[PDB]
Structure formats: structure tokens, C-alpha cells
Design a binder for these strands. Structure first.
Ligand SMILES: [K+]
Ligand SMILES: [K+]
Ligand SMILES: [K+]
Ligand SMILES: [K+]
Ligand SMILES: [K+]
Ligand SMILES: [K+]
Ligand SMILES: [K+]
Ligand SMILES: [K+]
Ligand SMILES: [Mg+2]
Ligand SMILES: [Mg+2]
Ligand SMILES: [Mg+2]
Ligand SMILES: [Mg+2]
Ligand SMILES: [Mg+2]
Ligand SMILES: [Mg+2]
Ligand SMILES: [Mg+2]
Ligand SMILES: [Mg+2]
Ligand SMILES: [Mg+2]
Ligand SMILES: [Mg+2]
Ligand SMILES: [Mg+2]
Ligand SMILES: [Mg+2]
Ligand SMILES: [Mg+2]
Ligand SMILES: [Mg+2]
Ligand SMILES: [Mg+2]
Ligand SMILES: [Mg+2]
Ligand SMILES: [Mg+2]
Ligand SMILES: [Mg+2]
Ligand SMILES: [Mg+2]
Ligand SMILES: [Mg+2]
Ligand SMILES: [Mg+2]
Ligand SMILES: [Mg+2]
Ligand SMILES: [Mg+2]
Ligand SMILES: [Mg+2]
Ligand SMILES: [Mg+2]
Lengths: 132, 117, 208, 313
RNA sequence: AUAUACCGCCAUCUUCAGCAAACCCUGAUGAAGGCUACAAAGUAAGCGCAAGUACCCACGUAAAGACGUUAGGUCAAGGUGUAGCCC
RNA sequence: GAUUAACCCAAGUCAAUAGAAGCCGGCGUAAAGAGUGUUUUAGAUCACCCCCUCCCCAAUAAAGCUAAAACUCACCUGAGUUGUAAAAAACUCCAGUUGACACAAAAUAGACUACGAAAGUGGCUUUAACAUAUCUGAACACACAAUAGCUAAGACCCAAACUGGGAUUAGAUACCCCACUAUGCUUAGCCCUAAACCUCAACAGUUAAAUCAACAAAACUGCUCGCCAGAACACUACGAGCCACAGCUUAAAACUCAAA
């Protein structure tokens, strides 16, 4: 039986998001990609470097906004601009979200030597697609 | 007339020894048995045994045994088609008294009641 | 199959189509109006409307084909038909005016009659009974009789007993032998008949 | 996820305001903005390449989006509105009752283009869930109604449960007859066999010359079977030696190229034969593109179908 | 060291169509069982199949394939519980 | 096991042993209706009232008889017959037709359900003949009791333990094939055993209430006799009785187990 990236059926009490509810074979069919860049196009270079950067930013944001992320990050690269789009919860005070945005954008801009912007969308609670 | 069942079974009140010892309760089921496929046998051997007789006398030369060979060939063809015919008529029930499937739907509507309601 | 079940096989027969309407029956009229609504498979690249088309020779050719090499299989067939015709013209010119009438020079007539002389009328099937397998004489359908005649002819020509003889010379010689009720393929038929005869007492073991 | 009437009413108010916003975004008249324009604007503004269209961005009217919900089936006093409520299938059995009642009244008084609706379409007209045997029983009752001397009132009713099906004609299309600089009538068609692609120009009048990539057909096709394929279309309609052909073929092997040319010539030849002859070519397999193409190899097996040897145990 | 503590990714039946929450009913309120369409106690969310999608079609081939089975495979992908080594 | 804490009782605590604490329940399948019938002394209330299946069907004993099928002999024909999943061994004074011809066994009837205490009894005839004008009742008696077996004298078609041969098998002391004996039959005496089970005691009565663990052949009342009380040891040991001498009946204990 296939296991990869499959949230398994339970008793009907486990809330899953839309991202979680779709196995890998639905990628490009029902669900899109969580990062968009040119490295994996034919004739393009530096796919390995974009992949390492993406893995770091996901770990970095998980621990920089601990308990606040309500879904996976969406990573967008245009030119040398890096856009991080995150769906977060509404528990932390707005002052802390502004501190962490200023801190994260600045720290990541100096780390990867590119202008980095963080876009936060807040939701009252994790959006539930279905109960498995 | 159905044979009698009075005094046939070992029961309280029945002085005599039992006449019948049914291993299953004598109670009508709500289903009949399934049409039992009949045992098949080798066919056309009579025609097969006339062909193989001429061969023995004609050193297995088909030119001398044409009429007998054509008989056996036709007989096998008829038995091949006959099985195809029977099979169709067996499922349709063209000759059957009734189909176990049809005869069981009828018993479902009038089930035997060995209990009180 | 890449054809859905809805696709019907193509009917390649010029005569079937030119037949006048009046000659048609009410059943044949329905089939013709029906096919106009049906899907038709593409015609395979083998059979055509040619008047020189022979389904038996095309089938014998495919049973000679090794590894999809139809060109070679077809080449051998036409070389056998040419070798048969040349051997008959040589027997014809060397014969007397009386014998000439009985000498067949058409290789298609020889090919067809040679196979019909090798078709076995009875067959043998193995049947498990009482812990020993028994050979049992059984009638054979016409399809199976024709196939066995071809398979025995090709098998005989592929036998290693023939040393350095090319297939068109081997097959042509075997066809002319069978055309005259001689040769090893006719003997193979007679043996199957003798084995089926000797196993006559075991015919009852068949249940169909 | 039940949806109340107040919820749908709010969703329609949002769609009408958003419909005017979307028209304002694209600089189009909000009054003449149709649903086809909405779909076009949403596809541009929110481009999605997801293979399943149902997963793509959509801005539809609430009636199209949300499922049909049955309304409450009893009032404040708790009394159900319909006399067949307690069956659990009031809509289905009310229909059976109405059809059964019509069959009775008839007694007291006395195909190609249409089909019966499927169970999933009946289950929407009724807004109930149905078994398969329920569907059959209802259809058996409608068929029993056609066999009777049904009048006009009994015919509008049966047509509600009949869905028009668009039969597609199998009649072969005919290419236009074109004329060259010299005024010679000709037709042009194309054919595909495996990876071979052919384009054939069949002239109305000729002597039987066939040019394949500028070469005589017998020089281009030295294999006699490839030439029989070229003969097949013309021979079948009794037109050997009556047309000139100039065709070009690329891709595939020698046999696939002969098949692609055969199909291209047959399609182009249909312009110069009678309609009855075109139907005979169709029924002879001369106008059908062969869909038989090489199957991919699968991983873990030797070929497209052949498996690796099952190792001796 | 332990895959007989596990996550992860899988084999296998599966070239299957079943799994099942919550209720209801039958059996004197036992382990258990629950269907007959001219119908007789079952209603069933959800999961799988199916449907959709990919490839050249509506075909085919891929993909998919639940719950479980074999303490099946892997502590040597990586991570890791327990135990152990630390000149 | 140590240690910490806790619990119980407490000038006691509680290890071993012993005693106290048991018959109105059951007997189709869990142990149990003893193979069958019949007394006395007794017991019961089912005996008077008050009533409806007498005779015939396959009880039993004796004598006589024989239709079908065998065996044997004879004449005439045939070269094989037998054996089967398939073979071998076996017979070849063998086989087939016809005729003559049982101390053996008893198609059909019988889809009947009768007789007898049970065991048993289903070809024909004849003779004799099937207890009890309350019920229960003998394991302290009496008379019976399938098959097998024993003793003695006969009969002998067929079947058939054992034994021999053939085949199978790793082996085959079996299953399969052939041959043949004890034995199955009769007479006269023994033996006294069966899943002798319809595992359901006799007699009288009831169908309503609670119908009723399950299954089996619905649930019960009155009365009486017989029998039963965890498994195994044990259809055993010992004692006793017996025409029984490798037998039958009656029938335990020790050790062992937490089940059966
Ligand atoms: K694992
Ligand atoms: K590991
Ligand atoms: K570890
Ligand atoms: K003390
Ligand atoms: K006994
Ligand atoms: K009888
Ligand atoms: K008799
Ligand atoms: K019994
Ligand atoms: Mg797999
Ligand atoms: Mg009584
Ligand atoms: Mg029984
Ligand atoms: Mg291959
Ligand atoms: Mg494991
Ligand atoms: Mg598909
Ligand atoms: Mg697959
Ligand atoms: Mg699927
Ligand atoms: Mg293991
Ligand atoms: Mg007992
Ligand atoms: Mg008794
Ligand atoms: Mg007694
Ligand atoms: Mg008495
Ligand atoms: Mg005795
Ligand atoms: Mg005796
Ligand atoms: Mg004997
Ligand atoms: Mg004797
Ligand atoms: Mg006698
Ligand atoms: Mg008895
Ligand atoms: Mg007893
Ligand atoms: Mg008594
Ligand atoms: Mg005991
Ligand atoms: Mg004993
Ligand atoms: Mg004893
Ligand atoms: Mg003693």
C-alpha cells in the first residue's frame, strides 16, 4: 500500500486541510505547487540551490512563527524578489506579527542576498476541508 | 397421495418404534434445488466406429472412406451445434417445467411457516 | 484493444456491395441499413480487395513468419509457388499428350489440395483418469483440422533432416508429395489416425 | 453542510455585486456581462493549469454552485405537508401514485432520438435518493403507459422523463474539390498510421500515376505489400488507372507510411465517387484512422505486456 | 543491539470490493445476527471501488486501490524510543 | 528480593492442621430410566361409579411344502473365462444355450406401519397359540435375551474372520483382486454380551398459567420403582457368584489434576 504524503482515514474526527487531503498523484491535477520558480524548467539552472533555499525557509518560518502557521507556505520567486505567503492564525498580538515580519524579512534578505517580502493572511482557525 | 407421517417418528405418545429416522426435519424449505447438470458421455462413437473400420480395410486411405468420413464429420458438427442449442434452451427454460430461479421467487412470496406469529 | 466494443470488423468484398437491391431479403436489407450507423475498424494492412488475394496462403505465410519478418515470409511463399509451377511445367513438357491432361500446373490448386490431403479427420486429447493419463480419440473442428495441416507442413520443412536445402525448395517438394498423397506429412496424418484407431476402446472416456 | 434559504439569498447578493466589480475590472459594460464573460475574465485573472477543471477558480451563480436542498417538510405544528411523508420517499411514491392513477383512468375511458432519463437525473427531479430497483419499477410503469392509448395530457407527462439524445451520423465527410492554376480539379486529404503522417492530392482525371515524395510509387515502395495498400482504395471502387496522385509522407516505417497514404488517398478519393460508394469504402475499413499505436513499456516488466520471468521457486 | 518499540517509504493478497462511525431492530435483552422489489428490519456519514484526471478518444494503458493480513522489508536513507560504548 | 509508602488486625499477628457450615436436586445430549417381563411383604389413588378399536396384517413353537436365483451332472457349440480406475495372479474336465436338480436364502407387495415383554418377526400351508376385570413392584429370585463365540453330531449353494497368492506402497501385518477355512444353517447343550439407543422408565392426567438455558423429539402435573452426585484411575484391582477358565456380572482404593 502506498504511504507517501497520504493522510489516512480515521474515525471521522481528524480535520485535514485541502493541502493535506490530496495524495501526490493529485499534484498538478487538483492541487498546485507550494513553490514556483524557473529552476525546474527545461534549460534552466540552479534547481538544486532553489530547493535548498525552499527547505530552509519552510523550517525557518515554522520555528519563527511557532504555533501560528495554519497551512503550508507558498513560495514565489520573480526575478531576484522572494515572496513568502503564509496563512497564519489570529492568536498572537498584532505587535508580535509586525515584529516578526520586520525581523524575518530583514534577516532573510541578508541571508540569501535578495529582497524578501513576507505576506501574512490571517484566519480565525485552521480551514478544514474534510474530516477523515 | 403423500405417504402418511402419523406414528412414523420417535415421539412422546407414540408407542411403536419409529418407522422413519430423518436426519433433517421434515419441513418444506423455501427453496428448491438447483438444476443438476447431467453427466456427459462420449457421442458419435457409432459414426466414429464406421470410419475407423473402413480405414482398417483400406490401409487408412481417405480416398476409399469418403462417405464414412463425411458421416462422422457431419455427426460431430451436429453434436457440436446441439450442445450450443441445449445450453440456450436450458437457460431460457423453453422445455423445462420451471426454472429453479423462477420457482424460488414464487416460494419467497408464500414461505413455509413452521412457527407461530 | 484500442477499438471500443462498438467497432465492427470491416467487410472487404466488392461483390457484397454491388449486389442489386431487389435480390436482397428483408433480413439482408436490415443488416445493410444497420451498418450505416455502426463504427468500422480500419482495414488491416494485410487483406485487400485484390482478385489475387488468397486467405489460405496469407495464413500459411503468417505461420512461416519469424519475428515479424513478413517480407521474408512472403518472399519464401512466392518462391515456393514459383518453384511448384516450374516443376510442373517441366513435368508437363516432358510428358506425352495423354499424360499432359492429368498434370496440374496451377500452384494454388496444388497448394490447396496438398493441405487438404494432410488435414486430419480425428484427433487425440490427453485425459486424466485413475491416476494415468490416457490418449482419447476426439472429433476435431474444421478450424483445427486446417491449422494442423499447415503446422505439420511448416514443421516438417523446418526439420534438421534437410541439410542446406532452402525453404522454397523444401516446401515445394513437400507440397507436391502431399498433392500426390505421399511424403512424411501424409504419414504423420496416418499415424494420428492409427493412434486414434488403436485407442478406439478409450473413446468413452470423453465426456463432451 | 446544510444551506438555508437566507444563506443562498446572501450568496446571490454577493454574486451580483461581484459581477459588477468583475465587469468594472475588465472595462466592460456591467449590464451586458454574461456568464461566458465571467468565466473568461476569471481564467485570465486567476490562471490555473490544474488538469481537472472542477478544481480551477470559479465564480458561478449560487444556484449553479450549491446543491439542491429539500425544504422543511413539516410546519410549526409538526404536521408534514405531504400525505406520503412517512414513507420517506414522498416524491418518488407521489410520482408512482400519479402514474398509477393515470393508467387506471385510461382503462375507464377505453425511440431513435429520445431515451429514458438515467437514475441520477430522476434523483434530481425528485430531489431524493433512489435505489436501482426503484428506478426500474418507475420505468416499467412509464413503458406500460406508452403502450396504452395515451392522450395529449398523458404525453406531456411522459416527455418530462425523456431526454433528447443527439445521435452523431457516421456519414463520411467529403473534401472540397479545388482547382489548380491549369484548371484541373483535385481533392486533398490527410492520413495517420502509427507515427507516419501523409497528405495526398488526388486529381479528378489522370492515368494512374502516384508520386510519393516526388518518387514513383514502385520505386518508393519496393515491397509489394506496400503497393497493394496503395491499390486497395482505387481497386475497391473500380478506379485503377483513372486518377493521378501526388502525396507526401513523413515519419514511421515503410508499412506505416503505406497505411498513412492509403487513408489519405481514400479520404481524398471520396470527393470523386458517389455517396453510396463512400459508404462502401467506410464499411470496408478504408476511411477509419487506425488507433493501434505502440504501447509504452511499464517499469518492473520486460515489455508493454511481457513480465520478467517469475523466478523458479 | 532491538524493524518483536517506531516515524518514514514499501512488499503482499489487490489480476480484490470491501471497511465503518452513529443509531435502530431480532435473538426471552447470550456469544452473535439484520435479506427476499408482486420485498419480510434495517438507516447508514465517511473511506475504497466507481466517477473524474494523465497519455492519442468515450477504447486501452497508466495512475489509483480502503480497512486489515504476513510482529512481512528496512534502526545501514534520514529521524528516533529503550539499552549499551565514551583513551 | 531489597527498599519507600500504604492497607488490615493489634499484644498480638496468622503459616499449617482440624472442625463448624451439605439429602425435598436430577436421570434425551452434561453423572444417571439399569437389554426384557413377571412376585411377596408393601405402596399408590390412577380400582366402584364412568364410557369409544374385540377380529384380520411381518408374535411364538412344530410339521410339511417351493417360485426366482445358484451349485452339480449331461448333450451340443465356442476358445477363451474371470478380474477393473487399471493390472496381475487365478480357472481352462472352462464358457454359452437347453434339460434335470437344495438341511442355503426368502424380489415385488411394503408409498403398508402390523405383531411380540424385549431381543426380534415381512415366501406358502396347517396345528397349537399371544398372562393379568386397579396400578406400581424383585440387583435377594424366576424365565428370556441380536450378533459373535464354545461343545458334539450333520448339511454345505453362496458369503466369509484367519491364512496363502496377486497388486499398490518408503513400508501395507490394510484399503483393491483371486482362492479357501472357522463361522453364518439344522439338531442337542452352553455362553448371557451390544450405540441390547426410539440413549427419552411404568401407570394416570393436562395443554392454562411463567411456553421455554441451548440443541434434540413442545411444556408440564400426580404417583411409584430403578438409577445418578468433578475428571481420570476404571467395562480396572480384590472379594463373591456362575456349565462361564484369555469369560461374564457386581465393583473400589491409592497416587494425579483444576478441570473434565
Ligand atoms: K515500518
Ligand atoms: K534508521
Ligand atoms: K535506534
Ligand atoms: K502464636
Ligand atoms: K448394556
Ligand atoms: K418390500
Ligand atoms: K420372498
Ligand atoms: K439408537
Ligand atoms: Mg504498488
Ligand atoms: Mg402418558
Ligand atoms: Mg442426526
Ligand atoms: Mg518483446
Ligand atoms: Mg515488521
Ligand atoms: Mg480511462
Ligand atoms: Mg499500477
Ligand atoms: Mg479509481
Ligand atoms: Mg520480522
Ligand atoms: Mg450421559
Ligand atoms: Mg428400557
Ligand atoms: Mg428387571
Ligand atoms: Mg407388575
Ligand atoms: Mg444369546
Ligand atoms: Mg452358533
Ligand atoms: Mg465362495
Ligand atoms: Mg464352511
Ligand atoms: Mg433355512
Ligand atoms: Mg435394536
Ligand atoms: Mg439404556
Ligand atoms: Mg419399571
Ligand atoms: Mg468420577
Ligand atoms: Mg463389556
Ligand atoms: Mg472384569
Ligand atoms: Mg477376579
Amino acid at each position: 500500500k502506498n504511504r507517501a504524503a497520504r493522510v489516512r482515514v480515521s474515525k471521522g474526527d481528524k480535520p485535514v486541510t485541502y493541502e493535506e487531503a490530496h495524495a501526490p498523484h493529485y499534484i498538478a491535477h487538483r492541487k498546485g505547487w507550494l513553490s514556483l520558480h524557473t529552476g525546474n524548467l527545461d534549460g534552466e539552472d540552479h534547481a538544486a540551490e532553489r530547493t535548498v533555499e525552499d527547505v530552509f525557509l519552510r523550517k525557518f518560518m515554522w520555528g519563527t512563527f511557532p504555533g501560528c502557521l495554519a497551512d503550508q507556505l507558498v513560495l514565489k520567486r520573480r526575478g531576484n524578489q522572494l515572496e513568502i505567503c503564509a496563512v497564519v492564525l489570529r492568536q498572537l498580538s498584532p505587535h508580535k506579527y509586525y515584529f516578526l515580519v520586520g525581523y524575518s524579512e530583514t534577516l532573510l534578505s541578508y541571508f540569501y542576498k535578495c529582497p524578501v517580502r513576507l505576506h501574512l493572511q490571517t484566519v480565525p482557525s485552521k480551514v478544514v476541508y474534510k474530516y477523515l | 397421495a403423500t405417504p402418511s407421517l402419523r406414528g412414523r417418528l420417535a415421539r412422546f405418545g407414540n408407542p411403536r418404534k419409529p418407522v422413519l429416522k430423518p436426519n433433517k426435519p421434515l419441513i418444506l424449505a423455501n427453496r428448491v434445488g438447483e438444476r443438476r447438470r447431467e453427466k456427459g458421455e462420449a457421442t458419435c462413437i457409432t459414426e466414429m466406429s464406421v470410419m475407423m473400420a473402413c480405414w482398417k480395410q483400406n490401409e487408412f486411405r481417405d480416398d476409399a472412406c469418403r462417405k464414412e468420413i463425411q458421416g462422422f464429420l457431419d455427426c460431430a458438427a451436429r453434436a457440436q451445434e446441439a450442445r450450443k442449442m441445449r445450453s440456450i434452451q436450458e437457460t431460457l427454460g423453453e422445455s423445462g417445467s420451471l426454472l429453479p430461479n423462477k420457482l424460488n421467487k414464487l416460494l419467497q412470496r408464500f414461505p413455509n411457516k413452521p412457527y407461530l406469529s | 484493444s484500442r477499438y471500443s466494443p462498438e467497432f465492427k470488423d470491416p467487410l472487404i468484398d466488392k461483390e457484397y456491395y454491388r449486389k442489386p437491391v431487389e435480390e436482397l431479403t428483408e433480413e439482408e436489407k436490415y443488416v445493410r441499413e444497420l451498418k450505416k450507423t455502426q463504427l468500422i475498424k480500419a482495414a488491416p494492412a494485410g487483406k485487400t480487395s485484390s482478385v489475387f488475394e488468397d486467405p489460405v496462403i496469407s495464413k500459411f505465410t503468417n505461420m512461416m513468419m519469424i519475428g515479424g519478418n513478413k517480407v521474408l515470409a512472403r518472399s519464401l511463399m512466392i518462391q515456393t509457388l514459383e518453384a511448384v509451377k516450374r516443376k510442373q511445367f517441366e513435368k508437363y513438357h516432358a510428358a506425352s499428350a495423354e499424360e499432359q491432361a492429368t498434370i496440374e500446373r496451377n500452384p494454388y490448386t496444388i497448394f490447396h489440395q496438398a493441405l487438404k490431403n494432410c488435414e486430419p479427420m480425428i484427433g487425440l486429447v490427453p485425459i486424466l483418469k485413475g491416476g494415468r493419463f490416457y490418449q482419447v480419440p476426439v472429433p476435431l473442428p474444421d478450424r483445427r483440422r486446417r491449422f494442423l495441416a499447415m503446422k505439420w507442413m511448416i514443421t516438417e520443412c523446418r526439420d534438421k533432416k534437410h541439410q542446406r536445402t532452402l525453404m522454397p525448395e523444401k516446401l515445394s517438394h513437400k507440397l507436391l508429395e502431399a498433392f500426390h498423397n505421399q511424403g512424411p506429412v501424409i504419414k504423420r496424418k496416418h499415424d494420428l489416425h492409427k493412434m486414434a484407431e488403436a485407442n478406439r476402446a478409450l473413446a468413452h472416456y470423453r465426456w463432451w | 453542510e446544510t444551506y438555508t434559504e437566507d444563506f443562498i439569498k446572501k450568496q446571490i447578493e454577493e454574486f451580483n455585486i461581484g459581477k459588477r466589480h468583475l465587469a468594472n475590472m475588465m472595462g466592460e459594460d456591467p449590464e451586458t456581462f454574461t456568464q461566458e464573460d465571467i468565466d473568461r475574465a476569471i481564467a485570465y485573472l486567476f490562471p490555473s493549469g490544474l488538469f481537472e477543471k472542477r478544481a480551477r477558480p470559479v465564480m458561478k451563480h449560487p444556484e449553479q454552485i450549491f446543491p439542491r436542498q429539500r425544504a422543511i417538510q413539516w410546519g410549526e405544528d409538526g404536521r408534514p405537508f405531504h400525505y406520503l411523508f412517512y414513507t420517506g420517499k414522498q416524491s418518488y411514491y407521489s410520482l408512482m401514485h400519479d402514474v398509477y392513477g393515470m393508467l387506471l383512468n385510461l382503462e375507464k375511458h377505453q425511440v431513435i432520438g429520445s431515451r429514458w432519463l438515467i437514475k441520477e437525473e430522476l434523483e434530481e427531479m425528485l430531489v431524493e435518493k433512489l435505489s436501482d430497483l426503484d428506478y426500474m419499477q418507475f420505468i416499467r410503469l412509464l413503458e406500460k403507459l406508452l403502450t396504452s392509448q395515451c392522450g395529449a395530457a398523458e404525453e406531456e407527462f411522459v416527455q418530462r422523463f425523456r431526454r433528447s439524445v443527439t445521435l452523431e451520423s457516421k456519414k463520411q465527410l467529403i473534401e472540397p474539390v479545388q482547382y489548380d492554376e491549369q484548371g484541373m480539379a483535385f481533392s486533398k486529404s490527410e492520413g495517420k498510421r502509427k507515427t507516419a503522417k501523409a497528405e495526398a492530392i488526388v486529381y479528378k482525371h489522370g492515368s494512374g500515376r502516384i508520386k510519393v515524395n516526388g518518387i514513383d510509387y514502385q520505386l518508393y515502395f519496393p515491397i509489394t505489400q506496400d503497393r497493394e495498400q496503395l491499390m486497395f482504395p482505387f481497386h475497391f471502387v473500380d478506379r485503377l488507372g483513372k486518377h493521378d496522385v501526388t502525396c507526401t509522407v513523413s515519419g514511421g516505417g515503410r508499412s506505416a507510411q503505406a497505411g498513412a497514404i492509403r487513408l489519405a488517398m481514400a479520404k481524398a478519393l471520396c470527393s470523386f465517387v458517389t455517396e453510396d460508394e463512400v459508404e462502401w469504402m467506410r464499411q470496408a475499413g478504408l476511411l477509419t484512422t487506425d488507433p493501434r499505436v505502440r504501447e509504452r513499456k511499464k517499469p518492473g516488466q520486460e515489455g508493454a505486456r511481457r513480465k520478467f520471468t517469475w523466478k523458479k521457486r
